[PDB]
From Swiss-Prot, chains A, B:
Lineage: Bacteria, Bacillati, Bacillota, Bacilli, Bacillales
Xref: SUPFAM superfamilies: Double Clp-N motif, P-loop containing nucleoside triphosphate hydrolases
Species this protein is from: Bacillus subtilis (strain 168)
Region (I): 161-408
Gene that this sequence comes from: clpC
Domain Clp R as annotated: residue spans: 1-142
Organism superkingdom: Bacteria
GO-annotated molecular function: ATP binding; ATP hydrolysis activity
Disulfide bonds: none
UniProt domain UVR: residue ranges: 415-450
Protein name (Swiss-Prot/TrEMBL): Negative regulator of genetic competence ClpC/MecB
Listed CDD domains: AAA (cd00009), RecA-like_ClpB_Hsp104-like (cd19499)
Function of the molecule: Competence gene repressor; required for cell growth at high temperature. Negative regulator of comK expression. May interact with MecA to negatively regulate comK.
Family under the similarity heading: Belongs to the ClpA/ClpB family. ClpC subfamily.
Region Repeat 2, residue ranges: 78-142
Length: 798, 798
């Protein structure tokens, strides 16, 4: 385990002691047994003293089955029987939930594993094996903290709370109920909605999906102690649990009958609280179908305050109840449940820390925990603000802890050796001679002690991680999905975005700066981390920055939605060309955009060509920028948490897709650049209305094809080849010299920079595959395509 | 609770007296027991007295517990054990007879809590605990209500009345009859339609929601004694209860089987009255979906008069059932059940006071009750007339119940200390380090007595509420949803709309007065609270005032619909761009408009840009303004009677988005404003027909631009940012001076007002994050962003 009681550990050490005290030198089970009776009156020990075994009595039997004498004090560790007895105690502590394995379990396990000399000791001293494990069993594992009340009662309350199900109040008079911690400010408005007689039913609305259920345990506690409303000093909180109702049932009618019965017992009225999780399913109102319609019984019950109950609902659900009316809305009365404030999140993290130290790690690091929240909110960003957090904590809170046991210092080579030993030894005896294995056999166990010694020198990598979570690590888990290497990502965002966007620094730094602002905490946690317009004809920088933003902003290159607004005008791939039949802008608002971002609430949203979209589209995107949400697709609310809204524009094109050209001067190229990095930021505004664009912050600048912009395209295409070759296991790189020979057949004026892919096909794809076919390069070696003296050359490296 | 009986209380105090008489300075449970038997022959006392226990017999044992003695009356209160016995009796009174506890319950509770000092006393004095609990239980005492009984007539009655169900007739033959508070004029018209054997079935049509069910108990009472026709003195009223049908069911087929069984027994025909609430559901006829098709048996039954029944259907519901015809049209025959008169509501409130006095927040305030109705009736309006009512009372019927138990005087600080004591106290003794605990213990209980003393000084906030709802309170609660600070909201409507909307006073006073007239109880809902036209093109204050009526006056937050008529057009729209394809005005009337308002009967419905809509759109909308109702959405009736319909005008845009700069002056601007608030009342005229405009309460005037929109755009974005940062828990405000500095980077000629987001990012997000990081500002302190010396400055406030 790695968690034990004193008593346990004490029984264990006593075995080795007894090995030698009796003449043995290897601790069989016999010494463990001895350990139990020699540990005196721990629950194992005590047990043995009850059934009639003394420390003496055991050790003499133990000694009569080797002992007196083999003494010379040969290395006293276990032997396989004895190891088995121990394996059982771990499970004999699991059995009763002891996460810190106690004395009892070792005797229980000993008996279970009742063979070896121990077994024989115990069966000799007038005690059957099961009589011994019994005695131990019937006295606790020693891992309790429940109960704090010894009272008794009987009252009208009996029929209701029986059925169906629990009593939160009980468990908090047993000193075993946690707040848990929410969402603290959430609990308060509920207590108004709970001391009424009409409107006496609370209904919590948020995301479910925030750990909402924590707020409920709040109530339990406050109904007990100590200053609370008059009927809340005469209230009991009883849970309506769906799980018990469905169990033993498989008919809808029977479920309804049972619910009717619960309502009959609800006669504790004006003094009873029923807690109903996921309230919607019972009401059955709205939608294209129900879910079971409790409403006939449920509606008058809810309005009158004979059923005074607590509803846990989500984004959409409330709409479909006030539509039902007029006892639905009578009962309900609202309370604000947030996707908890940055601070609220943090407190939850800390609260469940020690049990990821039962998932043996975090315990700590604090900076990493705060970050778990902060980094999560902005970096993935695919749930509500705390759910994300805790996931970073345990993931990273294991990731390095996984690195704990995978080597010695580098003495992993020992383990490798110990294997080779077995073999030589074995095969030699397997043929025989005896001694043709012997020295090999001996060499093995020498090795073994060394192996194991340096594997428990990598208890130092345990003491490193088994109370940590790492900053960099927590950050790493956020980087893994889609503090340190996410806030280093935040700080070095610019560096990361620059390494993946080549051409137009103007744009890169601009996205960087809006995002880094947001990513430091200040900016909406529920609106895009950047809204942007990404300018310049398609060919250089736009998409690539969106991608690069995923890498820096999200921690890995992945997860970017991308919808073309130019199709949404209901006249471009509405039915015209390749798309789908819908009347396209209605589809986009009504489903496409909202559904897509709903999958990853963090996704870099690239709304292409908002210029060429209808003016209605500009409003739709504007609504993302205003609300931070869009509600569509049957009333679902899509959380654009820290999406990066990127609105593209392909304008400026004539200069920005020109030829850098020698105008008569070689400074017509270096002034075609300087001109193009000017021309874009005025060409966007003319193609679409202002109402959208003003809630779009930075003006991201890019261009494309020139003389020179062309040669930036060649290096994008050659890179598209090299990545698709990796999946089989081929490591390829083109050096610039080889990209040059590829360019040699695509600097046409009469076919432009279109031929470059094709010239990559002949000189890269075709050449590498024809070089792999000849076997001068290979899988799992890095393969360099270079040009030497005007001719291509395929090389192999490492 | 505070509501017991003499005998109970008497049994309790006698314990303490005898305690001290025997040397028991804490009145044990042994003394409570002594108390029980010392009260002589009350049910607790008597009970004990049966089994053979004297006042004495207890007291001797008791004196043999704590000796005799040490009495000098060391803080003589009960034991915690003894306090448990009392809590139990309280529940034993909920459970048994009188809600307000009695003698029986105290011995019953003693036994129940049978372990501890009492228990051990009784177990020493040869009387088993349960033998005692028997004795008390069995003489609870029969409290009638004016009841009378002896025998029952007739034999045929057996199969039917068992099933399914309790009879209204029964409770009135034992003086347990209901008020009932109608809808009184409704009850009489039934007896014509019921002393028929032809159109033998009465059918009540009206809101759910009316409290229709009140009318039914009316009948019960008079059918017994005695104003009814000759065989209607010997009629019986039996209710078809949905709850019994669903209980024991397993399918739709089984539900039908139960209805079939009723029909066979229905042979009590023409002398039996069947009450079917929500009659429509069983017939299953009409609509796109049924709900179960009882109609095969039910239709001939109605025609025959074997089912001579009373149908309660909703305002809208009936149409798709009389449509079956004509043995359901020679059955049914309608009777007027109104949307309740204001007064009927009020009376229900009064009637249910004594259990709303259980949670000590009524009886009274009467004015608050009246208001409960009146304030709800026009605004929220999410239910129907009496649900609305009670819901405010009870809403408020907790709000104040919270204001009680949030403090002692301010001595919450005491409790905080008393905690800290325990710790210190404990930990010192745990070290032992005895006397270093001693004084800590003493300090603890010092605190405690004070703590508890000032927690029961907040019995004064109890005496406040335990008969009073608070007028202002009811009002606060209506404000929570959407008398005093809601009817002061009504009376002061201009002031309240002014306190949350700035400029266009012209609009405010007109809207204010019209809404206050209706909303103060002087306009019945059968035509909107206010229909209005709100004039002036974009950037006015139209929407904001509509919003502000809901929000400010009646609420504190949501209750505002908002529909654009230019999207729901027939020549400007049919299916164009975004949203649902159906031929657009047909979708809006036929579906959308009706659906939205049907959910909330009060929302300020703001029909935007209803000047670009043609007069055909206006004819249907005109009915909304006139009737307060539309029937659309598959024959559903939508209450706009409690909406405020607000219709806008926008077709002179150029003048109301005019900016006058030079006119040989710079005072043509400050005369372009004054001009625009005139020009609006003519912009109404240009594309809004007069037929429409007349069905309006007042013509509400607004005016826009002139200069001065830019720094208002900065104020829309900066507030949109900061509020979503309030979600994270940062309290931010921007002063106008700082919004001005932001505007400084956004008065570009060629790049429009687009830079304003970007400059908000720089001046708010970036600036606050660079100020929070340096600790100048605090997260969740109030942070003011200002310009000082023409340069921006971030300042701090609590």
């Amino acid at each position: 385990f790695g968690r034990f009681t004193e008593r346990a550990q004490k029984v264990l050490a006593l075995a080795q002691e007894e090995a030698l005290r009796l003449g043995h030198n290897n601790i069989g089970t016999e010494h463990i047994l001895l350990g139990l009776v020699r540990e005196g009156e721990g629950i194992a020990a005590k047990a043995l003293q009850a059934l009639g075994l003394g420390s003496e009595k055991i050790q003499k039997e133990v000694e009569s089955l080797i002992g007196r004498g083999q003494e010379m004090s040969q290395t006293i560790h276990y032997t396989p029987r004895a190891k088995k007895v121990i394996e059982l105690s771990m499970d004999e502590a699991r059995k009763l939930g002891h996460s810190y394995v106690g004395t009892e379990h070792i005797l229980l396990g000993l008996i279970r594993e009742g063979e070896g000399v121990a077994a024989r000791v115990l069966n000799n001293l007038g005690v059957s094996l099961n009589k011994a494990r019994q005695q131990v069993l019937q006295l606790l594992g020693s891992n309790e903290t429940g109960s704090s009340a010894a009272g008794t009662n009987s009252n009208a309350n009996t029929p209701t709370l029986d059925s169906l199900a629990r009593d939160l109040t009980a468990i908090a008079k047993e000193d075993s109920l946690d707040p848990v911690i929410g969402r603290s400010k959430e609990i308060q408005r509920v207590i108004e909605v709970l001391s009424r007689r009409t409107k006496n039913n609370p209904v919590l609305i948020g995301e479910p999906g925030v750990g909402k259920t924590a707020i409920a345990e709040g109530l339990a506690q406050q109904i007990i102690n100590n200053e609370v409303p008059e009927i809340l000093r005469d209230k009991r909180v009883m849970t309506l649990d769906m799980g018990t109702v469905v169990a033993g049932t498989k008919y809808r009618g029977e479920f309804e009958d049972r619910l009717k019965k619960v309502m009959d017992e609800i006669r504790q009225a004006g003094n009873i609280i029923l807690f109903i999780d996921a309230l919607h399913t019972l009401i059955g109102a709205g939608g294209a179908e129900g879910a079971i319609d409790a409403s006939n019984i449920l509606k008058p019950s809810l309005a009158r305050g004979e059923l005074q109950c607590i509803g846990a609902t989500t984004l959409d659900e409330y709409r479909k109840y006030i539509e039902k009316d007029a006892a639905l809305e009578r009962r309900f009365q609202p309370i604000q449940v947030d996707q908890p404030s940055v601070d609220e999140s943090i407190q939850i993290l800390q609260g469940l820390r020690d049990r990821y130290e039962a998932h043996h790690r975090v315990s700590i690091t604090d900076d990493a925990i705060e970050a778990a929240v902060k980094l999560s909110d902005r970096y993935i960003s695919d749930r509500f603000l705390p759910d994300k957090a805790i996931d970073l904590i345990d993931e990273a809170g294991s990731k390095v802890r996984l690195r704990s046991f995978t080597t010695p210092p580098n003495l992993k080579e020992l383990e490798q050796k110990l294997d080779e030993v077995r073999k030589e030894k074995d095969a030699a005896v397997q043929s025989q001679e005896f001694e043709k294995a012997a020295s090999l056999r001996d060499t093995e166990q020498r090795l073994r002690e060394q192996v194991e010694d340096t594997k428990k020198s990598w208890k130092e990598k345990q003491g490193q991680e088994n109370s940590e979570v790492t900053v960099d690590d927590i950050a790493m888990v956020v980087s893994s999905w889609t503090a340190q290497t996410e806030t280093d990502k935040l700080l070095n965002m610019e560096n990361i975005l620059h390494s993946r966007v080549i051409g137009q620094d103007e744009a890169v730094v601009a996205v960087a700066k809006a995002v880094r602002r947001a990513r430091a905490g200040l900016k909406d946690p529920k609106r895009p981390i950047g809204s942007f317009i990404f300018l310049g004809p398609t060919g250089v920088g736009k998409t690539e920055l969106a991608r690069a933003l995923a890498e820096s902003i999200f921690g890995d290159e992945e997860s970017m939605i991308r919808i073309d607004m130019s199709e949404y005008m209901e006249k471009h791939s509405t039915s015209r060309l390749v798309g789908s039949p819908p009347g396209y802008v209605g589809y986009d608002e009504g489903g496409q955009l909202t559904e897509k971002v709903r999958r990853k609430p963090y996704s870099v949203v690239l709304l292409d060509e908002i210029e060429k979209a209808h003016p209605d589209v500009f409003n739709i995107l504007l609504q993302v920028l205003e609300d931070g949400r869009l509600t569509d697709s049957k009333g679902r609310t899509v959380d654009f948490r820290n999406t990066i809204l990127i609105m593209t524009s392909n304008v400026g094109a004539s200069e920005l897709k020109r030829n850098k050209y020698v105008g008569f001067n070689v400074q017509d190229e270096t002034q075609n650049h300087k001109d193009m990095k000017d021309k874009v930021m005025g060409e966007l505004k003319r193609a679409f209305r202002p109402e959208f664009i003003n809630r779009i912050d930075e003006i991201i600048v890019f261009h494309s094809l020139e003389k020179k912009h062309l040669t930036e395209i060649v290096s994008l295409m050659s890179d598209q080849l090299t990545k698709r070759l990796k999946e089989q296991d081929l490591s390829i790189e083109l050096t610039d010299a080889a990209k040059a020979k590829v360019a040699e057949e695509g600097v046409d004026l009469e076919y432009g920079a279109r031929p470059l892919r094709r010239a990559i096909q002949k000189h890269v794809e075709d050449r590498l595959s024809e070089e792999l076919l000849r076997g001068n390069i290979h899988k799992g070696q890095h393969i360099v395509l270079d040009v030497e003296d005007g001719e291509f050359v395929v090389k192999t490296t490492a």
